[PDB]
């Protein structure tokens, strides 16, 4: 990956799409080994981790009332 | 065989903690910076007490 | 000249609170703010 | 000039005043940290 | 030797308090406190005698800018000549130095406190 955005252009490229295989411990291209993922999965998911992270920053004071 | 119940022989008195799992390790760390957080104001000739 | 003007320099000073606060929860020193409110605010009328 | 003119009795009041005043300062400590867009969001 | 009645508070402070205007900087409001503290031992002894903190302090202020004498200070006994050398009030010195010395340096200690650990009886 660190590569990938130094890969510069000329496909040769190359360089992306390569993820963990756990089974066989290798570092092999998804696409062939045929893991794949929709891309609205990966925008709903960033937007919606976000929202937890950014509301519990901002609480200062937690304020407890016990029940009646 | 000398009665009904037969109790489980448990390898640790009872009383005993437990470990491994996970987390572990971590709870000495959390003990540790819990015990700094006191410290780290003290720093300084600015330092509080 | 009298002891209602006394209480109204009092009363200046209790507005001062709200451009502290400002300086105090973004992490400003609130003294150096306002040694610049004051230099600024005498010859500007307002916007300051 | 003192012993003369009044003396000041029951001075409770000047406690209960005072008993006040500082049980609402304690209130608007809390709130005072939300105060700019600076400030932070109270979960109750 | 000094003397009493409260003109020895009043003179150390309006020392302090032209200072402040000299040094400025980020201390200008710590001289300020100082000077505000050292008069509240004189409107203390207005106040169990029935008189106006406001109006005593400001007669004992303005005397101190008119003219050098530092013996004027608050009568609780209401003979009037509020010049001390009339009045034979007279303390030592080394009772009013302590009572600064005692009371700067313990309030360095506590406002140094940060952390409270209290535990039960």
């Known amino acids: 990956h660190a590569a990938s955005q130094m890969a510069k252009p000329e496909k040769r490229r190359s360089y992306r799409n390569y993820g963990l295989d756990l089974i066989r411990g290798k570092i092999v291209d998804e696409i062939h080994a045929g893991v794949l993922e929709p891309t609205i999965s990966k925008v709903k998911s960033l937007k919606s981790a976000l929202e937890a ?10 304020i407890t009332v016990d029940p009646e | 065989n000398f009665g009904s119940q037969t109790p489980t022989i448990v ?16 709870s000495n760390i959390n003990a540790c910076v819990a015990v700094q957080e006191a410290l780290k104001p003290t720093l300084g000739p600015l330092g509080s007490d | 000249e009298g002891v209602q003007a006394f209480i109204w ?9 709200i451009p502290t606060t400002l300086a105090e929860n973004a992490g400003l ?14 010859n500007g009328e307002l916007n300051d | 000039v003192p012993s003369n003119a009044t003396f000041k009795n029951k001075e409770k009041p000047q406690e209960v005043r005072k008993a006040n ?3 609402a300062r304690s209130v608007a400590d809390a709130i005072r940290t939300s105060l700019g867009p600076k400030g932070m969001d109270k979960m109750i | ?40 031992i004189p ?8 008189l106006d903190p406001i109006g005593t302090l400001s007669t004992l202020k303005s005397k101190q800018l008119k003219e050098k004498i530092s013996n004027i200070g608050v009568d609780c006994l209401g003979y009037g000549s509020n ?13 009013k130095k302590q009572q600064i010395l005692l009371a700067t340096q313990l309030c360095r200690m506590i406002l140094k406190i940060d952390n409270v650990i209290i535990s039960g009886k």
Do not use: W
């Not at chain 1, 992270?53 to 937690?62: F, Q």
């Not at chain 2, 390898?11 to 971590?26: F, R, Y």
């Not at chain 3, 020193?29 to 005498?42: M, Y």
């Not at chain 5, 309006?14 to 402040?20: G, H, K």
């Open chain 1, 53 to 62: 992270c950014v509301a519990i920053l901002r609480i200062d004071t937690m």
């Open chain 2, 11 to 26: 390898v640790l008195k009872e009383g005993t903690d437990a470990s491994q799992g996970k987390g572990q390790i971590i």
């Open chain 3, 9 to 17: 320099q009092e009363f200046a000073s209790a507005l001062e609170v």
């Open chain 3, 29 to 42: 020193n609130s003294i150096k703010v306002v040694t610049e409110l004051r230099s600024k605010h005498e």
């Open chain 4, 21 to 23: 005043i500082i049980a």
């Open chain 5, 1 to 40: 030797v000094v003397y009493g009645g409260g003109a020895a508070e009043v003179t150390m402070s309006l020392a302090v308090s032209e200072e402040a205007d000299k040094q400025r900087g980020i201390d200008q409001y710590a001289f300020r406190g100082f000077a505000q503290a050292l008069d509240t």
């Open chain 5, 43 to 50: 409107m203390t002894l207005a106040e169990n005698s029935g």
């Open chain 5, 83 to 95: 010049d001390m050398k009339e009045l034979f009030v007279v303390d030592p010195f080394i009772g």
